[PDB]
Symmetry: C2
Subunit: 258 residues, 2 copies
Amino acid sequence: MSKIAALQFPTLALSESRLDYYLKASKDNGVNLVVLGEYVINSFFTELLHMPKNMIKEQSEAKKESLIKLAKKYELEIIAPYVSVEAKSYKKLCLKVTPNGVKSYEQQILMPYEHWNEEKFFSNKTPSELKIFTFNYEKLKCALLFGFETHFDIFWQQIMAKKIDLVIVPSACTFESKQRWEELLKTRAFLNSTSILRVNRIGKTKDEWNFYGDTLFINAFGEIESKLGSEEEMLIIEPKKSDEARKLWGFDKIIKEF
Amino acid sequence: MSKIAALQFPTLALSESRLDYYLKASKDNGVNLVVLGEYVINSFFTELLHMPKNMIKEQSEAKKESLIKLAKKYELEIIAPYVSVEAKSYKKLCLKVTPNGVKSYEQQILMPYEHWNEEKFFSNKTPSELKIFTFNYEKLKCALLFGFETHFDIFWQQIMAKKIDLVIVPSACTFESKQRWEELLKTRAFLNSTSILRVNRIGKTKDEWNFYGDTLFINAFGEIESKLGSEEEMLIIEPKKSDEARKLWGFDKIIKEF
């Protein structure tokens, strides 16, 4: 039935040949939805601070055109974080590329820390009230969240209210926080009875920040179903409906009795 | 400084010296706040189902009188889950017994599961709006939560809103859920920058439900600072203010604009 492919990549080269191979391989395994991690289409954040505006635009626009073309050619959907280069500003988006159009999700909560200040570098619209990005994938109710945004309960309360089966989490996570991330996502999946697909990038930066993969899939019971290592590889998942797991603990039912 | 003693007990006997001994040992170690787990003053839930009403009342009322006397004698405070028997109705309370009076916390969300139906057995007031029980312990802002109530994000949002330093969680946890409980509490402490004191009971029931202790203290970084094993023992903790840990990630700073 419904299958999803998670591609664990470093920053892709300007050519599209590596992406095309994995997209055909995803479609050959009966996958109709593909997800990439953060800073795979684009160079990692710390290089973006020093790169020329026009090359960042070229890097982004080359892959967006490729995804649009490849989504048509292989008739599948692609979810990929994407740096939108505007006239006088940069926006951190996540694109959902289908054969019949492109949808975009503008990240609502960005890291403001000095050493990794995405809030300063990007010019994302500050929403008045947070709103989860959701979409239907065949028979699954899905939500899309950036890695940093999973830290905030408000999103999960909206996810539980909408009976989401699967939360797709493109991310860029350092190895040092490996265990904290597993415990967080396992807890989120259990408390909200939703499956979670966390897709990480791989690679080492000039500052020796180590992204060691660990793309993983968690079921609505909070159990890890499958996970990747630290190499460039593809994870294929068959996400199931959240209903049975929702009834076991009935957290939503309990909160709905108020 | 400010110290708290967690007493990991089985169901206490009607005429026990354990309470007088451990309260004095706490006060001799400079501890002014003592916490017991769930179903320590009273027999465990599944045994209460088969006990006569008057026996439950006597079991409860004997320990309340003792705690009142011991709180005055040793000049400290005691937090203890407590079955209040009115007429032929039962209320699952947590008492805070001090030298100058008793305050009570009525559990707001109770387990409704068939095999462990506290919602059916007890007659707790169905709350209008969920509201955390809070109190100051010397210079620390403390909150009180029953084990089951930690599963619901709404409580944790209020805990963060009040910038709570320590959440005290009397609980009754089966050994089978050891890892899930640890990951949950570490995540809540980290996400909300609060320390957590989880006090469990010990003992085996007739149906072979294993309460194997593992009373633990977690700091506001989400790290386990200390923990007990499966024996009857006392855990003394010196909880610190959450301020420094709260500034590290600044979850409150980010989230308060929504």
